Design a protein around this nucleic acid. Structure first.
Ligand SMILES: [Cl-]
Ligand SMILES: [Cl-]
Ligand SMILES: [Cl-]
Ligand SMILES: [Mg+2]
Ligand SMILES: [Mg+2]
Ligand SMILES: [Mg+2]
Ligand SMILES: [Mg+2]
Ligand SMILES: [Mg+2]
Ligand SMILES: [Mg+2]
Ligand SMILES: [Mg+2]
Ligand SMILES: [Mg+2]
Ligand SMILES: [Mg+2]
Ligand SMILES: [Mg+2]
Ligand SMILES: [Mg+2]
Ligand SMILES: [Mg+2]
Ligand SMILES: [Mg+2]
Ligand SMILES: [Mg+2]
Ligand SMILES: [Mg+2]
Ligand SMILES: [Mg+2]
Ligand SMILES: [Mg+2]
Ligand SMILES: [Mg+2]
Ligand code: NA
Ligand code: NA
Ligand code: NA
Ligand code: NA
Ligand code: NA
Ligand code: NA
Ligand code: NA
Ligand code: NA
Ligand code: NA
Ligand code: NA
Ligand code: NA
Ligand code: NA
Ligand code: NA
Ligand code: NA
Ligand code: NA
Ligand code: NA
Ligand code: NA
Ligand code: NA
Ligand code: NA
Ligand code: NA
Ligand code: NA
Lengths: 246, 119, 115, 145
RNA sequence: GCAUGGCAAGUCUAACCGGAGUAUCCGGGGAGGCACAGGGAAACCGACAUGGCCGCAGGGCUUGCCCGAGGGCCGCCGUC
RNA sequence: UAUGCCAGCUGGUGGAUUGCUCGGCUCAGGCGCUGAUGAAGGACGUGCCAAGCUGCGAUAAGCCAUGGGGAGCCGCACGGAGGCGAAGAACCAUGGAUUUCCGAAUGAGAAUCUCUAACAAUUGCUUCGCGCAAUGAGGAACCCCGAGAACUGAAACAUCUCAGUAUCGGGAGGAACAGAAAACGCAAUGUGAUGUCGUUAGUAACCGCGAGUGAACGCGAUACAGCCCAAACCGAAGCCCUCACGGGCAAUGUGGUGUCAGGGCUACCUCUCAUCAGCCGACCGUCUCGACGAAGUCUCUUGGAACAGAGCGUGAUACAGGGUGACAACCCCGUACUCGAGACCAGUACGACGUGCGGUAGUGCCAGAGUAGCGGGGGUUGGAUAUCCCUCGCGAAUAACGCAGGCAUCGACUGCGAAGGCUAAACACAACCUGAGACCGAUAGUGAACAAGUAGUGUGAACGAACGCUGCAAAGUACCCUCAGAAGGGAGGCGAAAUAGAGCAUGAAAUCAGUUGGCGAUCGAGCGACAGGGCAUACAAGGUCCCUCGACGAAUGAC
């Protein structure tokens, strides 16, 4: 199919052929599986002290004093799971493998399929992104990689009738629950993904909900955050081309 | 440290000299223009205007600056004790704005003017 | 509890065609596909070659693999073909998607089932 | 919902009398204990059987059946065509860590083939000749006497 | 064992290497494992890409009659 | 209707719940030795007032220098009094001063004190004099060398297993150990020091051949690095102390050469770029720390307080995180970007100085003995005839020789030279620094968020808790009455709130006081379920229900 390239003013400037991968049939299940793996693989191993609650010579008196056979020390019950200060029966364990494997084939396939999801205006609208455009993804001249001010990327977007999505991601959510106490107080909608070719868009990265990525290593997470296909993306003339062989 | 516990910790256990930065206040438009800084370490000489408390709006001369508790006493911003005495109602520099500076310190004025350092 | 939305849809289509059209093979294939993956068909060329016959579409309720040789000029319709199978088949005949078979022949006529 | 997930409130978690799930006694002993007494059922019998020749006195023949060669003669475009002629050593995988290559006679031979290997079986020769073919024995193959 | 999913006469990488958005992730790495032939203590030898019959589903026809994968019963082959 | 039962209401008791996190737990990166120049640890001191903690050490919460930092300060600790600071204090960094007693504890003795110069003790050198030096002890574990169980498994139990584990003795470092083949043995026209990681493989091997036990070569990676003596041939050409003088060592050999690309010697060829000794000496990277660092504190409403709602506007190489009287990119710290400093890498790489590599022919000159090897008895290992080691006895050759290649002997072939020595890097741990988190969130998580190894127990070894939350701000309740009263109570004052008033957020249940509804001093006990009556009931969140008659009318069905 055709891809309408845009200049930094937002005006049409020719058009290239939309590579084949964007025709890969959208497989949300595989995409989901690839996002799950990526998210699990970055989780850190944890677990309670191996000797927590065992640091005691407590012993049970046995029968004879009308007391349950519970190891005690200085008249205080100890060690056993049902005892306050006793060990945790089946606690979390450092040894546990919290990683998920995934076949390179299955994973690359999901990358392709996520890509394709990007080229369907309807999907991208369902995923929830806000925009008033008919073509998608949004392809732009490699000159974009030269921008430096965020403000300039804004204008470009407003001209491309896509800024409405950043308006969407311009709202932080203060989470329910104690994540808060661990430094996860906030969270925000995901907005536009900018895929360039030489380096990630320094000028676009700070944009609300935006994520910047490069064609050679852009992945399923960026392409489909939370495993949900159809993220409002903007490729670079060159990027678009590179992506084709992924 | 992106972790809340550490953030708060470091702020509460910061050595004396590192507390100065905790008693900083925004500078009036005129002054920001004049010294090329957005704020300054409020001193017991400056004049300042209350921007947020129950005293928001009032102005006065900074009477005291406590580095341990990171708070300042502004003249006339007080509380009525039971016995009738009048005592200062501590203020957080963050709800305050400096409108006049006491530059009796060569050093302070130096820093203020230089463009490579802030006071 | 199938996971593939595609496989899932394919099956819905196979039915709608077996119900509407007078097809009975489509409804037969649907039932096998609904069964566990392990029971699905995994057929190599060597077998198709052995029992197929021209002008009679060969229907594999599963996937076709590339071991063996195919000479007959037959039309094969599976859920999927390995890359080698589809390449080896298009050389002497035609490898077709079941979704195409259902459209070109909803009556499920002149078809031979192979597993 | 999984089975484990439905266990809360069942008390016995599927073990029957709460008296069952205790220690190894409920297993008739630790590991293969009693493989000769109470649990002899379905255990290969006790005993020594045969001998083994020292590992480095063993030869491992890399084998392949005519059917494979023959089924992909055309596809082996990168291999001699003549009045086909193929050196098996170059076809068989694992033909390096192998003490020698041997062709076996399983399947058919639908082409005239000139095969070069370190060894063949009767079946292999017969079939290859019967299809107007020939079998050439390698210099290594020169170990027949 | 099972259910789901990828690839398929194949399939998967391990440690590790490079890149990077630097514990994720993109690329590389097939060492090696399992599968592709078995039988025999060993020496050693080395198999049906289908020959016959029933017959489910499905298909065909001129509506009982053919074709009948899978399945079932034999043949036959390798080896001890 | 007393005693009393059930439920509720007000107040209490209690401290669950929800919310919060100054603490944990876990992972990750960096870094890593201290001590007779007396450590670590302990004791006792040290403040204006000072009990605990911290710091410090008779110069005692400290003295000096340099740099940074800055108008404030006098630790936790917010009192009273007093004081210090522009003579630039506080505070931070580095360096320096001081640094009681016990303590390896070292003059001798001793429960932290005492008695009349002291390396006690054992050593090395030695001016044979404690003159010069060494050792001692500590440290989270990691590491290396020795000693070495049992419960348990085998459904008993003895070999076997637990396990070379627990524990014990000795010792090093920042990493240890290992290491340049008398190797391997995909047997080869092959590989080429050593660790480690992945695999080889639960393979081979062991084993009441039960249960169980269990490698290696190789391969792929990480990191790479290779050398020095002994002797032959020289024979004092040498080394140590001292400024020097001078002394000591050394023919029982200092020093030269040389070390399987064998060497030496004799005659030659050519040459050095090997090696070894010494000089110089980083970049980058990484860890930590620091400097600078954009944009609203505008309108209206609610509110005690805007960080809320509506409106208007801004920054962004910065929309990580935190603070601030409620949800804050733009109020404050910071964050992106740029820059600087220290540490490590590393006395390494690179560079350079000196040395001289190598080759031919001749020469039976040299090449590590209780060794190789055999036997008796044990331990150990997968090691089986074929693991490694200990002990008792026996015991060889000399490169023209010797050892190995998983039974012995002889021959062949292939590998390779033991009985001397050293050796960077890649790997372990986590004390120390920093970072992180689908971990816990005050009966959890460390025993320990609090005086925590604290209070407290035990003669002792040892054992060992509980206790977090006023408020935006102390505005922490003046004045009056009462009282034996700085108690308590009343009245009153502050605050949005005091039912936020001090172990003070919220404030469950068990339960207590008072009280409302129902029952109640002639009556029977799983305390209820389903039916149906009495009595009782603010609103809200449920709105139905009753009778006449009439319509419909299953099974059943009359007087
Ligand atoms: Cl098949
Ligand atoms: Cl064997
Ligand atoms: Cl080798
Ligand atoms: Mg506990
Ligand atoms: Mg909650
Ligand atoms: Mg300035
Ligand atoms: Mg129960
Ligand atoms: Mg291979
Ligand atoms: Mg002493
Ligand atoms: Mg026993
Ligand atoms: Mg036993
Ligand atoms: Mg080691
Ligand atoms: Mg037994
Ligand atoms: Mg063992
Ligand atoms: Mg080996
Ligand atoms: Mg020498
Ligand atoms: Mg043993
Ligand atoms: Mg606790
Ligand atoms: Mg006692
Ligand atoms: Mg309360
Ligand atoms: Mg009565
Ligand atoms: Na303890
Ligand atoms: Na009791
Ligand atoms: Na793990
Ligand atoms: Na069961
Ligand atoms: Na049980
Ligand atoms: Na058993
Ligand atoms: Na028996
Ligand atoms: Na391979
Ligand atoms: Na360190
Ligand atoms: Na004190
Ligand atoms: Na000191
Ligand atoms: Na000494
Ligand atoms: Na002496
Ligand atoms: Na037993
Ligand atoms: Na017994
Ligand atoms: Na045994
Ligand atoms: Na090999
Ligand atoms: Na503020
Ligand atoms: Na012996
Ligand atoms: Na050998
Ligand atoms: Na508590």
């Amino acid at each position: 199919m055709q891809a309408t390239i845009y200049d930094l003013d937002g005006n049409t400037d020719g058009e290239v052929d939309l590579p084949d991968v964007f025709e890969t049939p959208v497989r949300s299940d595989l995409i989901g599986k690839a996002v799950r793996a990526a998210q699990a693989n970055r989780k850190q191993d944890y677990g309670s002290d191996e000797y927590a609650g065992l640091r005691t010579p407590a012993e049970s008196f046995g029968s004879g004093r009308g007391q349950a056979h519970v190891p005690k020390l200085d008249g205080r019950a100890r060690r056993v799971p049902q005892a306050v200060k006793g060990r945790s029966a089946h606690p979390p364990k450092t040894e546990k493998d919290r990683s998920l494997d995934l076949n390179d084939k299955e994973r690359q396939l999901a990358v392709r399929s996520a890509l394709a999801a990007t080229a369907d205006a309807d999907l991208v609208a369902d995923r929830g992104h806000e925009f008033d455009r008919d073509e998608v993804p949004v392809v732009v001249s490699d000159d974009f990689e030269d921008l430096v001010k965020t403000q300039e990327v804004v204008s470009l977007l407003e001209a491309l009738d896509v800024h409405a999505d950043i308006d969407r991601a311009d709202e932080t959510k203060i989470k329910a629950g104690q994540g808060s106490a661990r430094g996860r107080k906030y969270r925000r909608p995901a907005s536009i993904l900018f895929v360039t070719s030489d380096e990630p868009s320094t000028a676009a990265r700070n944009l609300a909900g935006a994520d910047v990525a490069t064609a050679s290593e852009v992945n399923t997470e960026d392409l489909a955050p939370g495993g949900a296909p159809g993220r409002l993306t903007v490729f670079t003339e060159s990027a678009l081309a590179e992506v084709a062989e992924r | 440290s992106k972790q809340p516990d550490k953030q708060r910790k470091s702020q509460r256990r910061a050595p004396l000299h590192e507390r100065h930065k905790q008693v900083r206040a925004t500078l009036s438009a005129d002054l920001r223009e004049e010294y090329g800084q957005r704020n300054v370490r409020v001193n017991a000489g400056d004049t300042v205007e209350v921007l947020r408390g129950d005293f928001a709006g009032e102005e006065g001369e900074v009477i005291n600056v406590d580095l341990d508790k990171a708070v300042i006493h502004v003249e006339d911003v007080t509380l009525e004790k039971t016995d009738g005495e009048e005592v200062p109602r501590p203020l957080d520099t963050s709800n305050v704005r400096v409108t006049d500076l006491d530059l009796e310190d060569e050093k302070r004025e130096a820093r203020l003017e230089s463009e490579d350092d802030s006071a | 509890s199938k996971t593939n939305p595609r496989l899932s849809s394919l099956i819905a289509d196979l039915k709608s065609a077996a119900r509407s059209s007078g097809g009975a093979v489509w409804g037969d294939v649907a039932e096998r596909l609904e069964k566990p993956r392990r029971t699905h068909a995994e057929v190599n060329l060597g077998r198709i070659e052995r029992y197929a016959q021209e002008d009679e579409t060969v229907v594999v309720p599963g996937k076709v693999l590339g071991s063996g040789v195919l000479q007959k000029d037959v039309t094969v319709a599976a859920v999927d073909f390995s890359g080698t199978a589809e390449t080896k088949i298009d050389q002497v005949g035609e490898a077709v998607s079941l979704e195409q078979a259902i459209e070109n022949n909803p009556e499920g006529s002149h078809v031979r089932v192979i597993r | 919902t999984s089975k484990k997930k439905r266990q809360r409130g069942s008390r016995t978690h599927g073990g029957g009398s709460h008296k069952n799930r205790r220690g190894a006694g409920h297993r008739g002993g630790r590991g293969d204990a009693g493989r000769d007494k109470h649990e002899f059922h379905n255990h290969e019998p006790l005993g020594k059987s045969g001998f083994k020749r020292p590992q480095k006195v063993q030869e491992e023949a890399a084998t392949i059946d005519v059917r494979e060669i023959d089924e992909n003669v055309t596809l082996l475009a990168a291999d001699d065509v003549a009045e086909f002629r193929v050196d098996v050593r170059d076809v068989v995988e694992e033909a390096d860590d192998a003490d020698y290559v041997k062709v076996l006679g399983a399947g058919q031979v639908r082409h005239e083939l000139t095969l070069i290997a370190d060894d063949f079986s009767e079946g292999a020769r017969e079939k290859v000749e019967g299809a107007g073919g020939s079998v050439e024995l390698t210099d290594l193959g020169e170990e027949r006497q």
